[PDB]
Amino acid sequence: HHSGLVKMSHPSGDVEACMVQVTCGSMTLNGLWLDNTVWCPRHVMCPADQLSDPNYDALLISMTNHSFSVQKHANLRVVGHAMQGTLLKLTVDVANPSTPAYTFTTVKPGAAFSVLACYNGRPTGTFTVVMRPNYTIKGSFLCGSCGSVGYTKEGSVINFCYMHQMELANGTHTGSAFDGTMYGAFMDKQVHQVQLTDKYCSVNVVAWLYAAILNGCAWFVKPNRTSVVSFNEWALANQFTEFVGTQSVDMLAVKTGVAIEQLLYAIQQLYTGFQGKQILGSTMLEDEFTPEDVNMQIMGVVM
């Protein structure tokens, strides 16, 4: 049996119209064009002979307006350049006539968002990730993908949340929000950086366990219950996030008649072992599906 759950990305058309190629002469990557502004990673200024110990303050001052070349696949003339954290804020003489209604917002661990992977300013693929507890993502990026963006949708509004920056030693990825900061303690310098331990997203595992009940799978549901407090205390010594309920999870407890605490108890049992059984055709806990994904794809309820 199939759960009816796939990794669902938002449609990318609105964002595709906002991608440009930006280059300083050394590195080439992608930028986000909205109104008279183009956002892109700041290591576009870096020479390849300094990606490990660059001084962006000094590189920026060495830049003038015509040090930046912005192209769409037209040519946009840069009339103003500024640095905000790990991003550049270039100003162009032409506003993107296809600019969507948009906002900038930070994504939190567990939540999902859609990524548009681009190269040379040309969109090449879209996928969806969940922000990991250690503020990385398990994406699919190669060289020249920096500036590829990540976004959630609320109605006709694009909430931009992620501009790709770099890959870590373990194959995962991370980038900056559009306020300038990197997620987690990372720095956009090509050196060894300590990575924090990842954790199972407790809320997303509950959403998954609910998704299994909505498909007729509920062998794990025992009448026993574990309080959120007792679960969170347990979660800290077991590499689980701490659980925080929502209306989206509450709606999933109403439809199934299964209490959140019954499933918290279930997660404690399953963590020690599935006892050879399968859940949605899996023998390990899944935490890459949000309550919203389950509500949307299975119950048809967007909120």
* CB of residue 248 to ligand P9R, shortest distance in Å: 22
Rg (alpha carbons) of the chain, rounded to whole number? 22
- x-marked contacts with its own copies along 15-54 as a string, rule CB under 8 A: -xx-------------------------------------
Tokens standing for residue 25: 């002469």
Which listed residue (244, 245, 282, 303) binds its own copies by CB under 8 A? 282
**Identity of the residue, 172 or 202, whose beta carbon is nearer to its own copies in the bound complex:** 172
Strands 75-76, 37-41: pairing kind: unpaired
Which listed residue (10, 81, 132, 173) binds ligand P9R by CB under 6 A? 173
Instruction: Report which secondary-structure segment, H or E, holds 234.
Output: helix 228-236
Tokens standing for residue 94: 């032409």
Q: Which does 47 bind (CB under 5 to 8 A by kind): its own copies, ligand P9R, none?
A: none
Distance CA 118, CA 70 (A): 15
Q: Interface with its own copies by CB under 8 A: which range of 7-15, 23-31, 61-69, 77-85?
A: 7-15
Distance CA 71, CA 94 (A): 12
Q: Interface with ligand P9R by CB under 6 A: which range of 160-168, 210-218, 229-237, 292-300?
A: 160-168
Distance CA 165, CA 174 (A): 6
Distance CA 234, CA 229 (A): 9
Binding residues (CB under 6 A) for ligand P9R: these are: 29, 43, 46, 51, 141-146, 165-169, 173, 188-190, 192
